[model samples]
Target: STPIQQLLEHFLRQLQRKDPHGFFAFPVTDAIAPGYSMIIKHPMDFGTMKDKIVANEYKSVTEFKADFKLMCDNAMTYNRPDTVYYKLAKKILHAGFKMMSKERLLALKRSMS
Candidate 1:
């Protein structure tokens, strides 16, 4: 795999670990979340992200961050603010964002090679 691909995979695994409850493990379906398909136009989840990474779809960390935000945003948008899903999404988003920070990632990249 390429450098960025390896980096993204490492980041993704760490992100997934943050979601111990598995709330963001898979895509939210209309069956589980009413009107989810209608409300969330672009659905995103950890599983999808892993596939994208394996497929070499993401070109940059920014694009990966966008999907991560989208996944959290979709949860926050579909579920009420007070719901566990929404709260967990926000927390996970924060953790993911911090993990992807320039300084942190630079340190990680340096550690990699």
Candidate 2:
């Protein structure tokens, strides 16, 4: 098969392991850390991406279209994939993970109301 097929088969075997990985919950009265005691929590949702308005950088419309096509082709070509930080993946043990109740998020959501 192709390389794609090999990658898919590898992930299938990796997920279905004997020992396996997991998380667990805590008690209700005590701050219940449910769902098999998982890690990685509390992330911020940054708003929308800002778009830049552009003007034609050519004398004629034909030249503008050609340059636009070239621009789209070269887009992300110079981008460094290794330096990109996707998101914050952190674990909360002692300092964070307080309350662990629906109300914590509930009150935080409707803070004023």
Candidate 3:
């Protein structure tokens, strides 16, 4: 199996190779879980890519989660929601949440509960 770092570099490497852009979105280290390990995986990484693409626009994971929760609630999307796109939405959201402020995460937890 390809190691995680090997795969991770591809995304960052793509930026260097395709660097005609003035700026590109790259995930900061803090966004990853401790030791840069993450457990969540979905069969189709395709969906996860889309989720991450939309991720930076949001200020908090909570907002992203709510948006995805509704998407999961969608009849067309919800039925096959597990790994189709909804699950990826969840996976990326959690990973990004790690980079958020402790203060905001606490508030996010409160709202969720």
Candidate 4:
């Protein structure tokens, strides 16, 4: 397998080439954890390109995540009474709380709590 840097460079090069407007959104760094990275939306700084993408005039990973999040947030907030949305949010919250609990447990184990 290619080294991580090499793979990232290759991917970035391809993104830069294919995405003229720089709407190449992806996980650019692993900051939160050893293997965790964030998915991002791109062309966010380019107004024209953003408009085009919003109009369904262009397609990119950046646009996909952005649109998805927008819809998800809207559903979560506006459809709170809807069983499906409520259940989805509850599941996500439970997972997040579990992770926090695990972190606390690890800290206590290390005597750093």
**Residue-level lDDT tens digits of model 3 in 20-79:** 331113321325323322322212222343344344444444553454334323323323
Candidate 1: worst 10 consecutive residues by lDDT? 104-113
In model 4, the runs with Cα more than 4 Å from the true position are: 1-75, 102-113
Model 2: per-residue Cα lDDT over 1-113, one tens digit each: 44434433332233223113311111111133233123222211111000110221233323322322332222223223342211111121111223223455467459658
- Sort order, TM-score high to low: 1, 4, 3, 2
Which candidate, 3 or 4, has the higher lDDT? Answer: 4
Among residues 3 or more apart in sequence or in different chains, the pairs in candidate 2 whose N, CA or C atoms overlap within 3 Å are 23-36, 23-37, 24-36, 24-37
lDDT of 1 by residue, 30-112 (tens): 88888888877899999999999999999889899999989988888889988998888888888887888889868966986
lDDT per residue as tens, model 4, 1-113: 23433432332343234334432233223452233223332313223333444455434434433443343343355334666644554444444344335565467459744
lDDT of 1 at 35: 84
**What lDDT does each candidate get?**
0.87, 0.25, 0.38, 0.39
Q: What's the true lDDT of residue 16 in model 2? A: 24
